[PDB]
């Protein structure tokens, strides 16, 4: 898959010039580092203006998702999040992490709280973790999802045990997003 | 195998993108869908009024990717011309019929098929993660969108997507998949 | 990593097969299913009356393969003891519950799950070829067979196969997936 | 996947000693040559006694299937065919090629006349063929399927254009098989 | 392997493209066809009236790619000069004969063949993915197009595409495949 | 994926014990050497009794095909050849090389004298060969095909230029085979 | 790498198995566990009363495999002598302590560790495939089993499995992991 | 997958233009060399102004970590360290190596002084090292961790034997960091 | 490992001096790159001379014939220089230069024979039939005879022999014109060195 | 490339003569195969002598210690022969033979030092912590001191030095007992050759 350029920089650097971050792959550690780099750069350029994050991620690792989530909360500006395609596992976490009222989904988007089976750390593969750290990371993820959606930690845990997707309207009712848009930005 | 253009250097696809021309000439995968969505968002940011042209020569693809691209196309406020060069199968045909009515063209020897040629298991294939409720949901979405785009009923769309055959340009016009057959830069007459 | 036995030489699995013991200790794939079916047909040809024992330690597998094995097991006229050692997930749990009633055992720390852990797209994966009508058909078959084997309703089977969690031996007995927990060669008491 | 032995020979050679041939993979040229070797051997050993062919094949190439079909017709003995799992494309061809009245399917078997897209020759991959030879090979396959099932060549062509599976009862009604068995051999 | 030209810079093929010269010197595959169509659309966007030069040294290719390029060539409103250097076989000969009549040239030792060498099951995928009816239809298209371009009948085109032989430049002129043999920019004002 | 037979041996070695040689792949140099070894062994075991060669070959190389053909002509016993599936290029050569009257094809068999690609010596997909020797090898192949089929060398050249397959009856008319058998009793 | 013994023949490991000696000298993986369970079932089929010898030199492993082997060991009606040569870490130490009390030996320079080195997300798949609740449950199982085998409390077992350190033979005797240190078949009638 | 910024450069080079160093992978020898190069460059550009180091490292090798630590101590400017995500083994060393009072962690960060595996020199996953030098390198690491955290060398050894992570507040109490920041205004 | 020299690699600079380098086996992609360079040099200035330095171990007849037709297609003079060795297609393109402007360095080696495994070309998948071998070999023989002045019979016979010629033997053969040592266009007689 | 000799490979025949070969780097799988052979030879006859031929460039401390404990675990006499070179773990297992039955061939080379990149073992994924390095190195040092008769201090210091000893230096060091040339159990004094 070729990556086009624009008057020179690639398409993603142009969108980043428009304060638009794309997260359209599995949330791994190098992806998380690139996303955090982009977020710190956008903060240094102008810390007040809004940022746009488009999410089409099938999943990822809890450590990477927590790093990105803390970086998003660390910004003082508003963060619009848009689910294009699917947002599963860490994707849904970052989707619900946007500032309330600015979390959107496209009409045919699919969102899922369920965790991939190897989505614990993914240093390499999924592998480097112990019992207390599994419990701590999963409690962190549950608390953050509960705070972002408004559901209880119990409801978050039970639904993250269930392998099913929600549509955009099911996601609004769940507290994961705010609005379903078939037109540009707020419209 | 990538030619460049200076008239300030960029490849041929980036020049066509400067002309608001997006190319989809491979299988509709997740990275392909993400680059296409990036190009569409950029074309929206530059000028939301001027038309966009999408040239489609796709063997097929994935419904997750195809639906992402389709929702992005519906997300645009400008007109979207779609052109079938070569073949448009499965997601290719979906995105082809997704163009604004009256602006869906095919070249004279183009071939179009709504059927998914094989692995009708569409999903992110690096880690394929899909199940019964989600298979029915994604395929119902695909059928409903094809019905809305072509004017057929969902029943006929389902039954015809079960059959592995290609249509010519005139059959595609009758099917509602396209509107016109173009044999020159001026939009030539349809139905021939 | 393959030990042999002369008591005329053969590997350990072929000796256990001489004792009418079949091992299923890997993911249920098409080659695995074909070797298992070969072993079952051979055990049928040798003596159709004596019991067969199948030890299951399977992470999952494919419904096409799992259904081939299940139909082959139902095809036998002899009793089929199934033993869960370690884990039985997806097709593993299906074949485990397929043993003759009263002869489905699990070891004390065994784990069982009807859910397919991921890629719920089950099919010959060298060339994955499956579609909407066939996804619903294969999954309806799997649900109906699980309902007949465990005694649950198809509705509860579908809803529970949507949830990713494992059961212990006592939960599996209550679920109908197995019958007894064995802590020794003599068939130890169940439900503990 | 390990292959067990029996008192020494592998499991498939033992089943072959019982006059049982297994075809449980894609019908390729080396598979077709092995199957033809087994059939010629079983014919030399005893040309009158029946042969058993168990089929679990996802598809294959028309040249290989035609070679195996001609070899089966070349035998003077009866050929029992059993569909375990699925019989698609060439698999279904060989399934219907068994002697009439001795073509069985297991209760959850799936059978499909539809042809894989690259199932024309498969010398290597699928590649070596010209227009007249495509038409000739497809006409051969259509005529043989029509003769085996009793359907017309028109019905065979149209249904081979349709990508769908038949159950065992749908296959009996179609003429592809004769009986659905949940018990050993004829029973 | 890749020389550059500063005239800030671009490779040699991009420079020739700046002179409106497109090179087709490899097997006609799907990505090659996509780059060729991109270049043709770009040359049309820059100037739809001025002539284009296509130099062909292709051993063959795939009918889907060749037909895509041919439809794109017919889609242009400008004249298309075609030059056979080396060999033009299968799709190569198709694109060679697709140039505007009077502007199809071959070099003195050029070899041309309409036959597809090695067995032609044209495929959308590099390792082809097409059904019998679609190959038969595409080959009928190829015969009709070659008959229109050369002036021979479809019967003769089919018969000769069955024959694995090459024509020299003069046999190609007599065949209707080309128009003139040039040893040094002899005709029509030596464009390139 | 290679079955055995009860004296342990694979399926092809058992068929070879019945004087049956299998040629079901492209005619390469190692394949030609194995076939020639089998033929010499069958000659030493019993030089009088017939040999059965089943051919399902998509093609091959002229050097390997010529080696096998010279070995077949070198045997004093009768050689039955059976085309199962496809016999193209060298495959068709070896099919027509059997003793005349003992060349059979199954009903849906396809035969082609044309070599579909690189009619090169093919030592192993990279050539070895010069102009005089390509001409010599192709002349040998044409002369042998003319002797086997009864066609003229001119007709053999012209048809080997044409990429097309023959059915069983067309092959019988061509002189490539003798009879089409749909049952082992039809074999002499 | 593989020596043989004719005593027609078998490798060295099959000969030791003929003396009822099973070797576990690599990482406890799923296929290794399946071969070990096969050998244990075979030794039970030959003679369920006579003792078995298990020599352990394992750096670690996976809890599913280790628990499968442990349940199989508990499933036998005979005594199980365990010998630590070299190191017994993670699952290695589990199987070491699983031998019948009084018949768990270590060589003088042996090293034993209950901690799982490198980060333990036990996995059914070699590149693990398990959810949080199932790892947490399996680790609770491991703690309970180690507490029963060693006589320590589950609290102390959890605390020490958090600690990345090795014990010598005497520390292991004091811990309850083993029973005796042997330098030359010193105890219980020198079985092996 | 590496974005650029308008003077063309990738995202990390832009952040480096703002005196920001990123350490988001395992501390290896080439990673250590790149980080040391960046630090020397930031020192030559302006030796007085502060540097920002963001750490998201699962671990690394003692030789690389010691090289980076000596370079950080070698700078005359203040070094702010920020733990985003995880800081384990050498990661935690470099985190605690920042100038005291300028060591931050994000709210859900996890820190561990223990090295999870092969606490070897790790030239490139295959060792180089002898008994006296493993002892020397581990003694250096222990002394440096004790100086950075304020714990005793004994407590550092005991806790580096234990495979467990600390939260932000536990890390503050340990002396590994100074404050947990959930907003860039909380930075001095 | 290709240096640069307003930026260009070394070959692009030499191309700015109208210098084309042929220092590999004459393959199909090499033929396409060389033909691209020749067409570009023709468009830039069709009258000024072109320089082709040849250090090629051999190649394929289809590629060599394509390049030869492109060289004959140019209206300008073509100086060819054999540096190192020029065998098979290399020697063909060497002899294709304009008469009087075909040079070799003193220790250069030239051979018309195609060494080990010669055909018409087309890389890993050969693509050659009986009539086409004869046609391409006749083309190569006729072109070598016209370029060297030998008869086609002698060209065929000598192309059957696997041996190399020095610069002076190549001059006598008609393959080149002059041996250029330590200078510019100064033959090996060294009356001008 | 391992010949056979009622069928067995050459190593299985030597094993029938109670001969174990150690001719590779002392790795974990090698240690497991060697321990298997030793346990088998013990079960076959626990009194009769065993012969271990050592030609090992080095190895890992965990594997070497496992093998050493197995050798000490046997009740029979163990003859060890250094053919070629015995370094690091090789020298350890060489010195582990019963006193008086540790031989070296005349041009054999022995080194207690672990050459380039020494640890405790466990192949591609190392697995070593601070306390365990010291423990395994102390074990190796104590075992070498007990086997050779040197002090543990001298053993540590000499294991720091990368150099090889000949057979006579190994006898003086306590590593071996006799040099066997052209005969059986005949020292290098050649009063018995």
UniProtKB/Swiss-Prot annotation, chains A, D:
GO molecular function: ATP-dependent peptidase activity; ATPase binding; serine-type endopeptidase activity
SUPFAM superfamilies assigned: ClpP/crotonase (SSF52096)
Gene3D superfamilies (alphabetical): 2-enoyl-CoA Hydratase, Chain A, domain 1
Subcellular location: Cytoplasm
CDD domains per record: S14_ClpP_2
The EC number(s) this enzyme carries: 3.4.21.92
Coiled coil: none
Primary location class: cytoplasm
Record text on subunit structure and interactions: Fourteen ClpP subunits assemble into 2 heptameric rings which stack back to back to give a disk-like structure with a central cavity, resembling the structure of eukaryotic proteasomes.
NCBIfam families (alphabetical): PRK00277.1, PRK12553.1
Protein's job: Cleaves peptides in various proteins in a process that requires ATP hydrolysis. Has a chymotrypsin-like activity. Plays a major role in the degradation of misfolded proteins.
Record family assignment: Belongs to the peptidase S14 family.
Protein name: ATP-dependent Clp protease proteolytic subunit 2
Organism: Chlamydia trachomatis serovar A (strain ATCC VR-571B / DSM 19440 / HAR-13)
Curated annotation (Swiss-Prot), chains B, C, E, G:
Listed InterPro entries: ClpP, ClpP/crotonase-like_dom_sf, ClpP/TepA, ClpP_His_AS, ClpP_Ser_AS
GO biological process, one term: protein quality control for misfolded or incompletely synthesized proteins
GO molecular function, one term: ATP-dependent peptidase activity
Localization per Swiss-Prot or TrEMBL: Cytoplasm
Keyword terms: Cytoplasm, Hydrolase, Protease, Serine protease
Active site: 90 (nucleophile), 115
Record-listed E.C. numbers: 3.4.21.92
Pfam assignment, any one: CLP_protease
Single GO cellular component term: cytoplasm
UniProt enzyme class: hydrolase
Source organism superkingdom: Bacteria
Catalytic activity: Hydrolysis of proteins to small peptides in the presence of ATP and magnesium. alpha-casein is the usual test substrate. In the absence of ATP, only oligopeptides shorter than five residues are hydrolyzed (such as succinyl-Leu-Tyr-|-NHMec, and Leu-Tyr-Leu-|-Tyr-Trp, in which cleavage of the -Tyr-|-Leu- and -Tyr-|-Trp bonds also occurs)
Function: Cleaves peptides in various proteins in a process that requires ATP hydrolysis. Has a chymotrypsin-like activity. Plays a major role in the degradation of misfolded proteins.
Family in the record: Belongs to the peptidase S14 family.
Quaternary structure note: Fourteen ClpP subunits assemble into 2 heptameric rings which stack back to back to give a disk-like structure with a central cavity, resembling the structure of eukaryotic proteasomes.
Name listed for the protein in its UniProt record: ATP-dependent Clp protease proteolytic subunit 2
Gene assigned in the entry: clpP2
Curated annotation (Swiss-Prot), chains I, J:
Highest taxon listed in the record's lineage: Bacteria
Family: Belongs to the peptidase S14 family.
NCBIfam families membership: PRK00277.1 (NF001368), PRK12553.1 (NF009205)
Pfam name, any one: CLP_protease
GO biological process: protein quality control for misfolded or incompletely synthesized proteins
UniProt cross-references to InterPro entries, sorted A to Z: ClpP, ClpP/crotonase-like_dom_sf, ClpP/TepA, ClpP_His_AS, ClpP_Ser_AS
Chemical reaction(s) catalysed: Hydrolysis of proteins to small peptides in the presence of ATP and magnesium. alpha-casein is the usual test substrate. In the absence of ATP, only oligopeptides shorter than five residues are hydrolyzed (such as succinyl-Leu-Tyr-|-NHMec, and Leu-Tyr-Leu-|-Tyr-Trp, in which cleavage of the -Tyr-|-Leu- and -Tyr-|-Trp bonds also occurs)
Active site (record annotation): 88 (nucleophile), 113
Broad enzyme group: hydrolase
Gene from which the chain derives: clpP2
Organism lineage: Bacteria, Pseudomonadati, Chlamydiota, Chlamydiia, Chlamydiales
Keyword Hydrolase attributed: yes
Coiled-coil ranges (or none): none
Subunit-structure text: Fourteen ClpP subunits assemble into 2 heptameric rings which stack back to back to give a disk-like structure with a central cavity, resembling the structure of eukaryotic proteasomes.
The EC number(s) this enzyme carries: 3.4.21.92
The protein's name: ATP-dependent Clp protease proteolytic subunit 2
GO molecular function: ATP-dependent peptidase activity; ATPase binding; serine-type endopeptidase activity
Protein species of origin: Chlamydia trachomatis serovar A (strain ATCC VR-571B / DSM 19440 / HAR-13)
Keywords associated with the record: Cytoplasm, Hydrolase, Protease, Serine protease
Function: Cleaves peptides in various proteins in a process that requires ATP hydrolysis. Has a chymotrypsin-like activity. Plays a major role in the degradation of misfolded proteins.
Subcellular location: Cytoplasm
PROSITE patterns linked to this entry: CLP_PROTEASE_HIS, CLP_PROTEASE_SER
A GO CC term assigned to this protein in UniProt: endopeptidase Clp complex
């Amino acid at each position: 898959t070729l990556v086009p350029y624009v008057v020179a920089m690639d398409i993603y650097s142009r969108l980043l010039k428009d304060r638009i971050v794309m997260i359209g792959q599995e949330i791994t550690e190098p992806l998380a580092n690139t996303v955090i780099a982009q977020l710190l750069f956008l903060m240094s350029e102008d810390p007040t203006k809004d940022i746009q994050i488009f999410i089409n991620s099938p999943g990822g690792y809890i450590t990477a998702g927590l790093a990105i989530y803390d970086t998003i909360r660390f910004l003082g500006c508003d963060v619009n999040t848009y689910c294009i395609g699917q947002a599963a596992s860490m994707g849904a976490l970052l989707l619900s992490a946007g500032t309330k009222g600015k979390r959107y989904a496209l009409p045919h988007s699919r969102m899922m709280i369920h965790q991939p089976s190897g989505g614990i750390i993914g240093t390499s593969a999924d592998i480097q973790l112990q019992a207390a750290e599994i419990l701590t990371l999963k409690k962190h993820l549950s608390n953050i999802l509960a705070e972002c959606t408004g559901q209880s930690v119990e409801k978050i845990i039970e639904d993250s045990e269930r392998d099913f997707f929600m549509g955009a309207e099911e996601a609004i009712a769940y507290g994961l997003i705010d609005k379903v848009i078939s037109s540009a930005k707020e419209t």
